[PDB]
């Protein structure tokens, strides 16, 4: 009697089912988390494809001005999108069976809500699934944490921000141009560039790419001669071999002479931990930034912070970026606002 | 020999390696970095942009910068001994000589650092992939900080070395060039996000397929020619999770070299394009359709409107030398706002 | 042991920077406007440089 | 003691940074 109860239950039908579900012999692993994931992602995918190709225009801002997002309605790959649900609906659950017809549903942006909810569910289940297979194969279980960062980002832009703003119409559009729109408006109303968490995110992705290129170049540089000339050096490695394929000492030495001796890593485990940690933390912080700005704790405001002796404002770059922000603000959703302050 | 003695001394194993490349690198690196600190602490941008730009004036780290030269200077190299400053250091700083200083010394600094990578690689006896990978960042600096302004009117429209200033350069390129719509930039984004993805996923995978080479829960201490992690287990895992996995370590490490570097190069192509205002600004089909049909709307057209707003309002403040006067009746805007 | 010369030079440099600002020498050196020098009694607009080869005479005015 | 040196130095650094943060609320750049 310790921690795990090591015991079985004798070739029962339900036990056979549990065995097949949790089987590590399946080409694609289908854990319990997969019992959630597969149907959700399939529904989401089907509705997404069909809508991206043939869905009628959607009244996104509830002002009876439908926006066209599908290919068969004059869009291309870059401009096509699944338009977010109507602002008249807000955060109300709008399933197909709550509409009078599929046509109404399409008009108010039901597809977006459906796809977003199903996708978030299925992706959470995807995270859980990564853990699950790690456990079934006797691995360490922290890949799903790493993947928890992107899940957090998706959850931020598809769920939390609509919650803070009171409408799924503020959720990120499922499309390229729509994404850009989301970004611009977000900058106008939260000044995300001046938010330290977004700066942390940029550090995460720039730094991530940097360390990717760095590690890659270092290991590629110190590959051990196992191949002939003009032949692919990749052939000099075989899957499953125990011998290391590159000179780690030579790489550490190079890096040591590039900057200084104590700037380099000696422990590969430490190095790869760092490689995993930097971008994941960055993205974590940016996701938090998107959600907390979803509750209007915006980026740093230095508008007219510098004054002269007489009391006149001396502009800085923050004032210029504020000018651009103003442009986006006054220009976005031209027919949606009736009152001078944009509080929603 | 004389040259041989020079080489021997320069290539000595010090705490900080020097080399011939060091002869080029260290002065220029030092001067660029120092010029940035000097400028962001003391020098203003009142006579170039009409902006406070230093700690001395009340800027913080986010709003302080070494701003671009005055538009009237054109593409002048702005030497201290140039016909513009004529030796006068004060007038030199007031003109914006620190920007060209930082840019040129930074450029030659980058050359020197790449040459350093090549030199150390050759001395140690490694393949020069670090330098190539670094050709990436160089392409970014050359295209954005040199080529783009050289294509434009003057250095004035080049990025200013500062946080909020860089932010300004960003929103400027959005509002004026529709830079997000440019496919080359999209490839760049693919490169960076893909790079961060690869970094994270490789790190996590190696960390979570580790072999038990110790008794402590601290697996760091337990680390040889033997692989410290199970490549086969990793392959199995990602094959059953994602459908496809790496099988060749060499190909893997090359791949996470290749993705981000390529990203950078592509986006650079884009930026050259913008240097000549050769933009990916519009989709003529949708503009014509929208012109004839007032009920047709996409996120593309919405972003076009956004660009127009950006351009007006900021146009008046961001380009003071133009003396742009936009009466409040001509400024584009929606209802109420 | 090596903290002596540093205890005589590090505070010295610190105070030297302090004095570089407090005496206002920095303003004169880098041509940075004082809080009361952005606008004079004659000019109420931003004093931008318009002449490339005559920036000295323009900055003098 | 090395640890005492690191502690004292760290406190000094944090004090200077704190002075900068205070400077964001006073004098130039404070919107006052």
């Amino acid at each position: 009697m310790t921690v795990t109860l090591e015991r079985r239950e004798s070739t029962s039908l339900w036990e056979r089912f549990c065995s097949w579900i949790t089987s590590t012999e399946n080409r694609l692993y289908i854990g319990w988390f997969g019992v959630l994931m597969i149907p959700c992602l399939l529904t989401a995918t089907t509705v997404f494809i069909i809508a991206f190709i043939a869905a009628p225009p959607v009244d996104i801002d509830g002002i009876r001005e439908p926006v066209s997002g599908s290919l068969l309605y004059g869009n291309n790959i870059i401009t096509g999108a699944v338009v977010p649900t109507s602002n008249a609906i807000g955060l109300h659950l709008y399933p197909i069976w709550e509409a009078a017809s599929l046509d109404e549903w399409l008009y108010n942006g039901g597809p977006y809500q459906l796809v977003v909810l199903h996708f978030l569910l299925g992706v959470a289940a995807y995270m859980g699934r990564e853990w699950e297979l790690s456990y079934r194969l006797g691995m360490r279980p922290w890949i799903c944490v790493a993947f928890s960062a992107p899940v957090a980002a998706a959850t931020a832009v598809f769920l939390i921000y609509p919650i803070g703003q009171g409408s799924f119409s503020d959720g990120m559009p499922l499309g390229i141009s729509g994404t850009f729109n989301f970004m611009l408006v977000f900058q106008a109303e939260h000044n995300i560039l001046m938010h330290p968490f977004h700066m942390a995110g940029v550090a995460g992705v720039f730094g991530g790419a940097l360390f990717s290129a760095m590690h890659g170049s270092l290991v590629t540089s110190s590959l051990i001669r196992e191949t002939t000339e003009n032949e692919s050096p990749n052939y000099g490695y075989k899957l499953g071999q125990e011998e290391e394929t590159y000179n780690i000492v030579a790489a550490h030495g190079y890096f040591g002479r590039l900057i200084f001796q104590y700037a380099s890593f000696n422990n590969s485990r430490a190095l790869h931990f760092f490689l995993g940690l930097w971008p994941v933390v960055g993205i974590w912080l940016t996701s938090i930034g998107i959600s907390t700005m979803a509750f209007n704790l915006n980026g740093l405001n230095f508008n007219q912070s510098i004054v002269d002796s007489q009391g006149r404002v001396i502009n800085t770059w923050a004032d210029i970026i504020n000018r651009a922000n103003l442009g986006i603000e006054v220009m976005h959703e031209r027919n949606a606002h009736n009152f001078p302050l944009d509080l929603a | 020999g004389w040259f041989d003695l020079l080489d021997d001394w320069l290539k000595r194993d010090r705490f900080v390696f020097i080399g011939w490349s060091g002869i080029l690198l260290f002065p220029c690196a030092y001067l660029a970095l120092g010029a940035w600190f000097t400028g962001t602490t003391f020098v203003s941008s009142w006579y170039t942009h009409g902006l406070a730009s230093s700690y001395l004036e009340g800027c913080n780290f986010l709003t302080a910068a070494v701003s671009s030269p005055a538009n009237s200077m054109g593409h002048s190299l702005l030497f201290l001994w140039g016909p513009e400053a004529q030796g006068d250091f004060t007038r030199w700083c007031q003109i914006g000589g620190l920007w060209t200083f930082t840019a040129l010394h930074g450029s030659f600094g980058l050359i020197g650092f790449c040459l350093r990578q090549f030199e150390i690689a050759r001395l140690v006896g490694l393949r020069p992939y670090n330098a190539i990978a670094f050709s990436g960042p160089i392409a970014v600096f050359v295209s954005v900080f040199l080529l783009y302004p050289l294509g434009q009117a003057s250095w004035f429209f080049a990025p200013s070395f500062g946080v909020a200033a860089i932010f300004r350069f960003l929103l400027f390129l959005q509002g004026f060039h529709n830079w997000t719509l440019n496919p080359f930039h999209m490839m760049g984004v693919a490169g960076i996000l893909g790079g961060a993805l690869l970094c994270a996923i490789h790190g996590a995978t190696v960390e979570n397929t580790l072999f038990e080479d110790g008794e402590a829960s601290d697996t760091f201490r337990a680390f040889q020619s033997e692989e410290t992690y199970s490549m086969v287990t990793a392959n199995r895992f990602w094959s059953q999770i994602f459908g496809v996995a790496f099988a060749n370590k060499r190909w893997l490490h090359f791949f996470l070299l290749f993705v981000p570097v390529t990203g950078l190069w592509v986006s650079s192509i884009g930026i050259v394009g913008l240097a000549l205002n050769l933009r990916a600004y519009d989709f003529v089909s949708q503009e014509i359709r929208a012109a004839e049909d007032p009920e047709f709307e996409t996120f593309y057209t919405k972003n076009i409107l956004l660009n127009e707003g950006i351009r007006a309002w900021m146009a008046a403040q961001d380009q003071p030398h133009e003396n742009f006067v936009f009466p409040e009746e001509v400024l584009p805007r929606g209802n109420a706002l | 042991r090596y903290w002596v010369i540093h205890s005589i030079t590090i505070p010295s440099l610190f105070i030297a920077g302090w004095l570089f600002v407090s005496t206002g020498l920095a303003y004169d050196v880098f041509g940075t406007p004082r809080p009361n020098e952005y606008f004079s009694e004659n000019r109420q607009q931003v004093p931008l440089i318009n002449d490339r080869f005559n920036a000295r005479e323009e900055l003098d005015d | 003691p090395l640890w005492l040196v690191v502690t004292f130095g760290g406190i000094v650094v944090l004090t200077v940074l704190g002075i900068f943060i205070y400077g964001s609320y006073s004098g130039l750049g404070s919107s006052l």
Binding site: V307, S309 | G34, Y55, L56 | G17 | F20, G23, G27, L28
Partner: peptide, 28 residues
């Protein structure tokens, strides 16, 4: 080169730190 580099970075750093503090007390 150790001395030259370490001092090359450290000396101006202290100079600048003093300067910026002094700036913290400059009133309008």
């Amino acid at each position: 080169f150790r001395w030259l580099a370490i001092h090359g970075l450290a000396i101006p750093t202290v100079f600048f730190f003093g300067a910026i503090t002094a700036m913290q007390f400059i009133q309008r």
